[PDB]
Amino acid sequence: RRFLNELADLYGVATSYTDYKGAHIEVSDDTLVKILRALGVNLDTSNLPNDDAIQRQIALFHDREFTRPLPPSVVAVEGDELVFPVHVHDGSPADVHIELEDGTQRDVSQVENWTAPREIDGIRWGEASFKIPGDLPLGWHKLHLKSNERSAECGLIITPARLSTADKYLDSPRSGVMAQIYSVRSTLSWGMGDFNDLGNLASVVAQDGADFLLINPMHAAEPLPPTEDSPYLPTTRRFINPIYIRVEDIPEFNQLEIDLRDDIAEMAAEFRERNLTSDIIERNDVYAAKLQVLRAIFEMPRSSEREANFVSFVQREGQGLIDFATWCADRETAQSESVHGTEPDRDELTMFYMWLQWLCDEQLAAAQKRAVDAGMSIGIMADLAVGVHPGGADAQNLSHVLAPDASVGAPPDGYNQQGQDWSQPPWHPVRLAEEGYIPWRNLLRTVLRHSGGIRVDHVLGLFRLFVMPRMQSPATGTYIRFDHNALVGILALEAELAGAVVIGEDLGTFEPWVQDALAQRGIMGTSILWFEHSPSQPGPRRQEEYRPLALTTVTTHDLPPTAGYLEGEHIALRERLGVLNTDPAAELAEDLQWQAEILDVAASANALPAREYVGLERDQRGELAELLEGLHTFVAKTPSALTCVCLVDMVGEKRAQNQPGTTRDMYPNWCIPLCDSEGNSVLIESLRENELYHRVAKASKRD
């Protein structure tokens, strides 16, 4: 075990941990070996390696480190004169320079290095140290090494000390609205919300003071139905789901012949009827129908201004676009049924999937423009899922920077007794760095392109991930470490270049250095009223104890909306799905007590009248609107830089969008259309007609 621990340490594989229920776990030998092998360490396939083979992997690690001409990459915060190692054949030149992102050359300076040379596979190697200048601009640079006829390069990435939005909003606190956009319909939506709806909704809530509209992840899933309902298991984290395209807004739509336009209107009219119902959302027939229309509009010729815009987009997005689109073409061809002696044209199909991304780009840009022209300081705030579907586009195209024999999840919980497996393949911590973090850069830059902020799901994943050998129980997992200076630094860099807010979903209870690494960069936490406990006294967090560098909400997409939550729906819902194991009554009683305590704290802050809630019957605490107003006021007057009103709470929705740890045959997660307390659909057009909307909007105002 001593040699296995030594090896695990060199690869950043944890040999023990504390679980989410606070238990101490020593990781098995078997798990260490399987995770090392998932990272590409050559240990015997029996998962029965001997001490020789482990010792030989130790020595190979040190030797391979000693023959790296440059580091995999070098990441530094602005102002740091960071020192890095170079390895050359002993007695040959170590000529090193910097090429900045803009093409400018810079120099490095040699500094003292005491390391002795070593012979490795018959070559004597030496080590030198060089120091970067402390005045490099932010961005994506390169280090270049020439040693006679040998050459090497690595990324040199310079990251900001602090996001400018952090002090802006600390100084000038604002509110916003969160919406699950697929669930919010206008009169014209095809059964589910689209990019037009996104921009429309932003413009509407902006009239009542909202400075951002936070939405679900919008990452692409399967390129044709059937398609994943969860926004949190997409096929890529870079490219965008074309299901959201409003086809009628495409300029070339208008070049279709009128009889085809009438056919399309007939399809449209049928999906539009769904907008008026409370029926579960069906992505598959909507998607299939849009794709059919998009295939027709793709034939229409573009004006030369439009063509040059499309070509400009394709140039900008580079090879990852072509790779994603080619993967879509391949998936389509494999699932479709070929006529005898006809082949689909892979290149034309590739072009079609490229073009769908260009449409997503321009419709999202127009949505953001609408939001900001309506007065929003931030605009759309995007959400970044933790990871991708294991058999999908990124799993293939980014294979070289993943460890697909491991699966991402969560260790065992008080609630989830066997932990969780989210099924995603993790980044490979070294190979991602060898690639200069360019895949992390590119997904971020796309996510932030038309947004004013990003919410990072599972932000702890910038530091470490809990992983298990694929197809094994989460009890068998362990943590793999990442270079947080790189992952967090690059998140801050991309956000700073985009003038963006960064929110890191903060829910767990991690080491002080981790919290500090985020806070120092101006990355905001997340405070959720129903989960918050006072650091100081027992019971709920007081108004004045809410963290300033945070997004504070009453609720989230993983909880029942507040009208349901007030009436015990979290418990009624878990019970009817058979996912509560404890006694329903004892749970409802615990819930009433906790609610009472929160309502008492709200009353100490003058947000509600001081009724002395502990003791009151559930239906004796005030009208729903009064309680909504009081909770929203309580949140609005916290010192939190940002607060978020959930759209569901503005219309009296009682149905949960997602019940965590239920599956799609248990509850229609991610399929619940926006409805009021009476189960009636609320369209975007009607939002501001209902008095409840205006009451909650006024209660949430911050100035």
Q: What is the DSSP string of 305-368?
A: HHHHHHHHHHHHHHHHHHHHHHHHHHHHHHHS-PPTT----HHHHHHHHHHHHHHHHHHHHHHH
Cα–Cα distance, 687 to 186 (Å, whole number): 10
DSSP 222: -
Per DSSP, the residues of 518-579 read: HHHTT-BEEEEGGG-B-SSSSSBPPGGGS-SSEEEES--TTS--HHHHHTTHHHHHHHHTT-
* Token pair of 230 as six digits: 């969860």
Method for structure elucidation = X-ray
Residue whose entry in the numeric block shows the structure tokens 């990272």:
39
Cα–Cα distance, 355 to 346 (Å, whole number): 14
Residue 142 lies in a domain: yes
Among the listed residues 143, 633, 692, the one whose alpha carbon sits nearest the alpha carbon of residue 436:
143
Say how far residue 53 (Cα) sits from the centre of its chain: 39
Q: Which helix (H) or strand (E) holds 52?
A: helix 51-66
Number of Cβ within a 10 Å radius of residue 682: 23
- The three-state DSSP-derived secondary structure of 75-141 is EEECCCCCEEEEEEECCCCCEEEEECCCCCEEECEEECCCCCCEEECCEEEEEEEEECCCCCCCEEE
Residues 195, 223: contact at Cβ < 8 Å? no
- What's the CA angle centered on 477, arms 428 and 230, to 5 degrees? 70
Among the listed residues 401, 384, 394, the one whose alpha carbon sits nearest the alpha carbon of residue 437:
401
Residue whose entry in the numeric block shows the structure tokens 């059919």:
292
Cis check for the bond before 429: say yes or no (omega within 30 of 0): no
Residue 363 lies in a domain: yes
Number of Cβ within a 10 Å radius of residue 34: 22
Q: 83 and 56, same structural domain?
A: no
* Token pair of 499 as six digits: 């003038």
DSSP 162: S
Q: 304 and 256, same structural domain?
A: yes
For 153, 175, 362, 404, the CA distances from 437, given in Å and listed in that order, are 14, 33, 26, 18
Cα–Cα distance, 388 to 366 (Å, whole number): 27
Residues 138, 493: contact at Cβ < 8 Å? yes
Collapsed DSSP state (helix, strand, coil) of residue 17: strand
**CATH number (domain holding residue 148):** 2.60.40.10
Residue 414 lies in a domain: no
Residue 75 bridge partners (DSSP):
157
DSSP 400: G
Q: 111 and 51, same structural domain?
A: no
Last residue of a domain, one of 348, 373, 398: 373
Beta-carbon contacts of residue 380 (< 8 Å; ≥ 6 apart): 198, 202, 212, 213, 215, 364, 367, 368, 371, 450, 451, 452, 453
Instruction: Please say whether the dihedral angle defined by the alpha carbons of residues 555, 560, 562 and 565, taken in this order, is positive or negative.
Output: negative
Cα–Cα distance, 11 to 403 (Å, whole number): 13
Residue 292 lies in a domain: yes
Q: 98 and 152, same structural domain?
A: yes
* Resolution, angstroms, 1 dp: 1.7
Beta strands 73-77; 83-89: pairing state: unpaired
Residue 354 lies in a domain: yes
Residues 36, 7: contact at Cβ < 8 Å? yes
The crossing angle, in degrees rounded to 10, of helices 51-66 and 2-10 is 30
Among the listed residues 218, 260, 217, 220, the one whose alpha carbon sits nearest the alpha carbon of residue 354:
220
The crossing angle, in degrees rounded to 10, of helices 346-373 and 195-206 is 10
Residues 523, 159: contact at Cβ < 8 Å? no
Cα–Cα distance, 657 to 687 (Å, whole number): 19
Q: 62 and 85, same structural domain?
A: no
Q: 84 and 54, same structural domain?
A: no
- Domain with 59, as residue range(s), is 2-66
Buried b or exposed e, range 74-88, using 16+ CB within 10 angstroms: bbbbbeeebbbbbbb
Cα–Cα distance, 366 to 150 (Å, whole number): 49
Residue 31 lies in a domain: yes
Cα–Cα distance, 701 to 698 (Å, whole number): 5
- What's the CA angle centered on 402, arms 397 and 407, to 5 degrees? 120
Q: 91 and 36, same structural domain?
A: no
Among the listed residues 487, 316, 325, the one whose alpha carbon sits nearest the alpha carbon of residue 396:
325
Strands (E), 11-72: 16-18, 24-26
The crossing angle, in degrees rounded to 10, of helices 283-298 and 346-373 is 110
Buried b or exposed e, range 540-577, using 16+ CB within 10 angstroms: bbbbebbbbbbbbbbbbbebbbbbbbbebbbbbbbbee
DSSP 384: E
How many CA atoms lie within 13 Å of 429's alpha carbon, on the beta-carbon side? Answer: 24
Say how far residue 426 (Cα) sits from the centre of its chain: 14
Residues 663, 272: contact at Cβ < 8 Å? no
Residue 149 lies in a domain: yes
Q: Please count the structural domains in the chain.
A: 3
Amino acid identity at 299: E
Residue whose entry in the numeric block shows the structure tokens 């490219």:
239
Residues 275, 680: contact at Cβ < 8 Å? no
Among the listed residues 483, 407, 481, the one whose alpha carbon sits nearest the alpha carbon of residue 440:
483
Cα–Cα distance, 131 to 156 (Å, whole number): 12
Q: 133 and 246, same structural domain?
A: no
Q: 225 and 288, same structural domain?
A: yes
Name the phi and psi angles at 543, rounded to 5.
Answer: -50, -50
Cα–Cα distance, 320 to 238 (Å, whole number): 9
Q: 62 and 93, same structural domain?
A: no
Q: 100 and 51, same structural domain?
A: no
Among the listed residues 635, 600, 629, 626, the one whose alpha carbon sits nearest the alpha carbon of residue 615:
600
Roughly how many angstroms between the first and final C-alpha of the chain, as a whole number? 61
Q: 344 and 220, same structural domain?
A: yes
DSSP 143: E
Number of Cβ within a 10 Å radius of residue 106: 16
Number of Cβ within a 10 Å radius of residue 414: 9
Residues 430, 484: contact at Cβ < 8 Å? no
* Token pair of 368 as six digits: 């953001």
Residue 143 lies in a domain: yes
Instruction: Please say whether the dihedral angle defined by the alpha carbons of residues 529, 532, 534 and 535, taken in this order, is positive or negative.
Output: negative
Cα–Cα distance, 598 to 533 (Å, whole number): 10
